[model samples]
Target: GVYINFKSEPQLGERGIVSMPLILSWGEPGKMITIEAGDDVFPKLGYSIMDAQLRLINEALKRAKTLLLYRLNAGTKAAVTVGNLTVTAKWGGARGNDITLVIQENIDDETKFDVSTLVDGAELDKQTVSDIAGLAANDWVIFSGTGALTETAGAPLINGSDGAVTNQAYIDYLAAVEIFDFNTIALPSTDDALKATFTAFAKRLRDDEGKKIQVVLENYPAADYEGVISVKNGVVLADGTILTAAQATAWVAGATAGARVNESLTYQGYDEAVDVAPRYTNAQIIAALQAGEFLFTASDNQALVEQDINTLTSFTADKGKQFAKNRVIRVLDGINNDFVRIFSKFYSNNADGRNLLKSECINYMNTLQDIDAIKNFDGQTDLTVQSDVDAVYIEAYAWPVDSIEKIYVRVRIKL
Candidate 1:
C-alpha cells in the first residue's frame, strides 16, 4: 500500500525553506517529524529531545508501512532500492521458522511460496546449492528449512554418547536449533584442484545446554559468489567454493577481497566475538547443515499482533474482510496501519506513562534508521507512559533485559 503526502509543497527555492523536507524518503509515521526549535523548520535551530523523539515515533510507523506497500518514497534512502530483510521465528519448543515465507505476494495459487523458496536451498545439498551470485541475480532469497531425518547407522552421538540415540537424535536436535557442534569444513585457498566443496551446514541455533546460537556468513557477496553455489529452483552448480559466514556476508556488504564485514551481527554475545563464536555462524556451514522452521510460542504469537491487520492471516479467513471496502487496505489504500495502529492504541491506553518509553523508542528507531552512538543517558527522556508499547518477541529468545536499564538479543541455530 502507499500513503499520500499532504505537505508536498517542495519550496526549496524559498528563503531558508526550513521545517519539513517537503520531500521525504520514509513513508507514513516515518515521514512524521517533530521540531522543538521553531515551527516546522529543518536546520532551523534548537529543539528539545522530546520533540525529536515524538517525530520519530511517527516516522518509524511510516517506515514500517513502506514494507507493506509497493510504493516507496519519491526520493529517499530506500526509495529506489531496499530489499526486505529475512527473519526467522523461534521459541523454546516450537519449530524453527521464518517470519513470513508464503506471503501470497500475488493472488495466484501456484504462486504460493513453497519450501524451496522459504528454505535456504544452498544449505540443503552442497551438490545442489547454487552459486551465491545466481541467487543475487534473483532476490537472493531463501529459507532455513527443516529437512526430513536420515538414518545414520552408527555415527555415534556427537558428544560421544553410548547409545542408539547419539547419531540421529543428536544430529536432529542440531538441525533443530542450529547448535553448531563441530567444525569439519575449512576454507579453501585456490580452487586449483577444486573438487567443488560439498561441505555440510548446520541450522541448530543452540548446544545441548540450550544456549542460543546463530549462523552468520560474513563478507559472502554475490560477486564473490564464485565461491558460494549458484542455485536455481532446487538445483545448484558445485563448480565453486563455499564461503564462511563472513563469506556469505560479502554479497550483503558488497565486500571485496579487502574489506571488513559491514554486517556486524550478534548471535547472542555479551562476551563473544563474531569470528570465534561458533561453527553455526559460518555461511557455508548453513549450506552444509540441516535446518528447520523455528517454532513460534504464545509470546511469539502475541508479537505477530504488531503486524498489519490486512496482512494478518486472521483477516484473510473471511474473504469478505479482504475486499477493498471492508478491508483496511481501502482505508489507507496500499498503506496498511499495522505499526501505526499499534502505536496509536498503545499511546491511547497508556496516555500517562508512555512519553518516556516513546522517547526511548524514538532514539532506538532513529539510530536504526541512522546508525550512531547513543549515550546511556540519552535513553531516559521526557513525559509519562512507561508501559506504552512493547516489541513482539517472535524469536527463539526475548529482549535480554536482565537489568532494568539494558536489553538483550536472543536466538538459537542448528548445526
Candidate 2:
C-alpha cells in the first residue's frame, strides 16, 4: 500500500486493527509490534503480567483481533549467580526480577545436580545436568555456568527496572504508529497533557490524512469530537478493588474495535478481567450520559456498558446528532468503505460507469437494510454523479440502528 504514497488511501477490510501502549521492562521498544489474539507470537514478543503495571495486557487481548503494542522503555535484564552458574532473565522487564534460581543435588544421581527456575515459589523450568556447560535455558531465563555446579537454593535476580514513561515517550509512540493501519487507539493515561496530544493526533489523522479512527481515553468529556470515547465509570473488580475509569482504557478500546458495524456495544458485557459491581448513582449516570461519556454499569455481578457512545454532543450549531452516536459513525465509515472500493475497482469517469457505481451502492445499502443494520436508504433518488469535474458525488442517506437505551409507555385506565 506504499508506492510514492499513491495507494495510501484508507480502504475496507482494514477496520479491526487496534493500537495500544505498554510500559514494559522487556520487549521491543519504539516499534509498531503486531499481536494476534490467541497467537503464540504475543508472549514471544512480551512477557506475561506478573505485576500490576502491565495489567492492560490481559484485558486488551480479550477482544481485539489484532493489536499494535508499543513498549515505552527497554529496561535492564535481571541476573543472579549460583556457584559457577550465572542465570539471566530471558527478557528485560521488572517481572524478570522476580525470577529465582534453585540448584540442588540430584538424589537419584549423586554425580548430577538439579537446577530449577522458579517464580513466586513455583517451579517453571528444571534441568538435571552434571556440568554447567550442558545446562539448558528455559522460556524465562538463560543459563550459563562453567565446570560442575553446586547446590544453591532460592537465589533471586536483582536491579531490574521498568523505567519511567514520559510525555516524549508517548509522542515517539504516535510517530511510530502513524505509518501503521489501526482502527482504534487506547492510551492508558489520564494526564491532561497526554490526552491533548492524542486528541490532536487523532484529529490530524481524521481531518487531514483522511484516516478514520477513534481513540479511547479517560474522563475526556470536553473532547466534543466523534473520534474520541471518554469513559466515566470506574469498575469494581472481583477482588473488591476498584479500577478507575482511567484504568479501563484497554478494555473499552479493545471491545469497541471488536464490535461489528451491525452491532451495538450498549449493554455489552465486560467480564473480561473481573466482575464489576455497581458504583454510580442514578443522577450521576444521567449526568454522565448527558456529557457524552461512555458509562459501564454493574449488573448481576458483571460490568456492562450503559451506552456505547463517544464524547460527541450536538452542543454547537456545527455539530449534529449523527456524530453523537457511535452507530452513526460506523455507518458513515461503512459508506466510506463502499465509496473507496467502487471507485478503485471500476472505471468511474463515464455516465454508464457512474450509473453502475450508483447501482452498486443501492444494492449494498439494500443488503444493509435487509439485515436491519440500517434503514430508509434512498440511494437511487439521492445518488448523483457528474463527469464534468471528472468526479463522482453521492448523496445517499441512511438511519443506523441504534440500540434501545430508553423506552416510553402510556397507559389509560377507564373507571
Candidate 3:
C-alpha cells in the first residue's frame, strides 16, 4: 500500500520520548538531569567520579542512549563570603567543596580586579570587575551581596554536606518521575520493603494508568509481574571490582529499556565485565531461570545474560509465556504507547475519524513489521476502529517477533 501526500506539506512520524530508560538512584543532591549523550553525563551531573550514582550512570549509559537521572539527596550548598562578596555553589553536593574563588588585580586595569572560579585547581570562569556588584555568576556558583570586593589568593567554600537519603527521597523521586515518560526504572536498593514499594509502583503505573513501564531490582522474584525484572546476581568488572545484585540492577534496567522491539538481551555481553560473581552451578542456573530470575553467566571469559526474562512465572491464557520475554513486551508496549499518543491528539469521534484512525494504526503496524518488531500483520483484516456514544474503540491483533534462544540438532548415519 502506498501512502499519498494530499496536503501541500510533509508530515513526520512521532518520535518517542519514553523510548529511553530512567534510573532512579541516590545521588549528590542536585536538579533532575536528563543525559541525552554519553558526554553530558559528567558535565551535567557534576564530576563526582567516586559517587555511586555516577558509577550507576556509567553502567546504564553503556547500554542505553539516553537516561533520566534524578538525584534523591537534597544536600547543602557550599558557600563562602570574602569581604562583602559571597559566592555559593550552583548545585547541592560535597563536590562544591572543591570550588575555590580567586581574586587578583587585573593586569590591564589597575583599578579593576579579576575574579576567577576554579574547581579542583582548574579555572572554569573568570571576570574583571571593579566591585562586588559588577561580579556575575557562572555555571559553578552564584554571586550575592553588593559592596567593595577584597582580593583573596584562593578562598575555598566550606561546610558542603551530602544530605541523608531516606525513604522519603525515593517517594519524592516517584512523584517527580511520574510526569516523565520512560521505558524502565532502576531501583538500586537491597531492602525488601523498598523492593515491594517499587514493585507496587510499577504495577500501578502499568495496570492502572496504562503507562507500560518495567522496573528492575535486585533479588525480588516475589514481584512476579511482567513489569518487574528481578536480578538474581551480579558480575565482576575487568578491574576486578565486584558488583552486588543491587548494583547490577542499573545495567539490567538500562539494557532492558535500551533493547529494541526486535532485539533481545539474551546472551548479550555485559560491557566491561569479565566474569559473573558468585558463579552458580548448572542446576542453580536452571532453577533461577525457572523462577524467572535474570542472572549473568560466565561464557568465553565474558559475562552474558542467561535469559532475558522478567519476574513472571505464573502465566495465564491472556498472557502466556510470551509476556515474560522483554522483547515481546517492548513490541506490545510500543504499540499501546504509540496508539495512545496518536489518538489522544484531538481526533474526532466520527466515521471519517474512525477510518483515519484505522489507517494510522495500519501505518504504524506496517512500520513495526518493516523493522521485524512484529510479523504477519494484515493491515486490512488485523485492525478495526469503531466508535460508540461513550468513546472510540480500537482493536488490533499483532504477533511480536522473538529471537531464537535454543536449537536442537539431529544426525543420522547409515553404514
Candidate 4:
C-alpha cells in the first residue's frame, strides 16, 4: 500500500541520529548545511572528505542512521576575470581553485560564443550564449562573464584559502544544533581550547538544558564525566599514516548514537574502503585501557576496539564499576526516554496516576530484560514513583548485563 506523508520539522523516532561539526576548507557553508542520509551514492562536491573518502563516511553511517553536518566557516572561493567578464566559485573554499574557464567560437553560430567550465583540466559544463544572460551555471561555478566573449584557454582561478576557526564559529554551530535532537555530539577538533569549550557546553546541556546527551572526543583524559567518551588511539589511513583518535571522532560518536540498549561495542572493527596497516602495539593498547582511554587496534585489515569505555574513572566506591560501563548509561537513558514521554502525555496527581506511571516503567523494564539488556528485574518491587501537580520523581533499581570479557582455565593431571 502507498501512504502519503508530509515533511515535518526533523523529529526522532525509535533511534538513529548523530551531530557532527567540521571546519570546511571548501563547502557551501551554512546555507548548504547537509543532512547526509549516508547512502551508496557518494556526494560529488569534489572534496575527498565528502565524495571520495567513503571510508570515513561509511564508518559512521554503517552504524548510525544519519549525520547532521555543520560546516564551520573556512576558505575563500576562487574566482577569475577576463575584460568585463568576472567568474566566481559557487561555494566558499579552496576547491574553487580547481576551476578554469575557456571561451571559444560556436561552430553553429559564430556570433554566439561557446563557453566551457573545466575542473582540473576536465570539462564540467559547456554553454553557448550571445550574452551572459543566456549562460547557465553548473555544479562548480557561477556565470558573470559578460559582453562579447573572447577566445581564451584555461583561465585558471587562484588565491583560494581555508580560513581558521574561531570560538565564535563553534558557538554558532552549537546554537544551530539545538533546534534538532541528536543521540551523540562529537568534538573532532584536536585543539585543546576547543575541547575545553565543548566539554563545558556538553555539561551545560546535560545539566541545565535537561538534555540526556553524551559527547565523544579524543585523548581527553582530563574529562572524567559519564557524558564524555575519551578515545585514545587513531586508525591507520590508506597511505600508512596515523591521524590520532581525532580522525575517528566522527565514527565513534555516530556509532555511539545508534547503538541499541542491549549492544556493546567491544571488538567492533573499523571496515575500510581504503587499505591500511596496524599502528599500535599490544602493550600500548593495554596502557591506554588502564588510563581509561578508549583504544582501537587492527585485526585482519580492520580497525577494532581493544577496549570500549568512557573516560569515567571518578565514580565513588559505592557507585562501583557499574556506572563506568556504557551499557549502564544506555539503560538509564532508556529509562529517561520512557519517563519523559509518559510525563509529557499526562499529569496524574493522585495515587492511581502514580501507579499508572509505575506500571509503564515496569513494562519498560520488562522489555529491556526481554532484549537481554537487563536481568532479574522485579519491576513492582524495584520501581516506585511520587507525583504532584508541580513535579514528579521516580526511583528505579535496575541491573545491566556486562559482557563476559575473560575466562580462567586450569588443568588437572593424575600420575
TM-score on alpha carbons, each prediction: 0.17, 0.80, 0.83, 0.84
| Number of clashes recorded per candidate | 96, 3, 0, 4
- Over the full model, what C-alpha lDDT does candidate 2 score relative to the true structure? 0.74
Q: RMSD of candidate 2 to the true fold?
A: 9.9
Total residue pair clashes for candidate 3: 0
Candidate 1 residue lDDT tens string, 218-309: 22122121112211111011222222332222121111111111111112111111222122233533332212111111121121111111
Q: For residues 1-415, what per-residue lDDT tens digits would candidate 4 score against the true structure? A: 9999998785312556788777665655654254555453323445544453334454566577877777777568889987667788877777778889898888989899888988878887898888777888777878784566677867988777667767788788888887777778778778888787777877787767657677888789688777788877677755565555786877788778888878777788754513223356778777766666777767677777766677778767444556556666666666665556555654345678667767876887788889988777787577777752645566766777773321111111111
- Give the Cα error of residue 128 in candidate 2, in Å: 4.8
Q: CA lDDT of each candidate? A: 0.21, 0.74, 0.78, 0.69
Query: Residue 152 of model 1: what lDDT?
Result: 15
Q: Tell me the spans in candidate 1 whose CA falls farther than 4 Å from its real position.
A: 1-167, 171-349, 372-415
- What's model 1's overall lDDT? 0.21
Better of 2 and 4 by lDDT: 2
Decide which is better by TM-score, 2 or 4.
Answer: 4
Ranking by lDDT: 3, 2, 4, 1
Cα lDDT of model 3 by residue, 1-415, tens digit: 8887665755512222222222322233434567764465455656653466478777776777667777777677888999889999887778778899999999999899999999889998999999988988888889999878899999998777775667777787787788888888888788798899889999999878878888898999999999999999999999888998988988888888778878889999888898998799999999999999999999998999999999999987666788889887787777767666666663456788678867977898899889988777788788887663646777777777773321111111111
Model 3 CA lDDT for position 307: 92
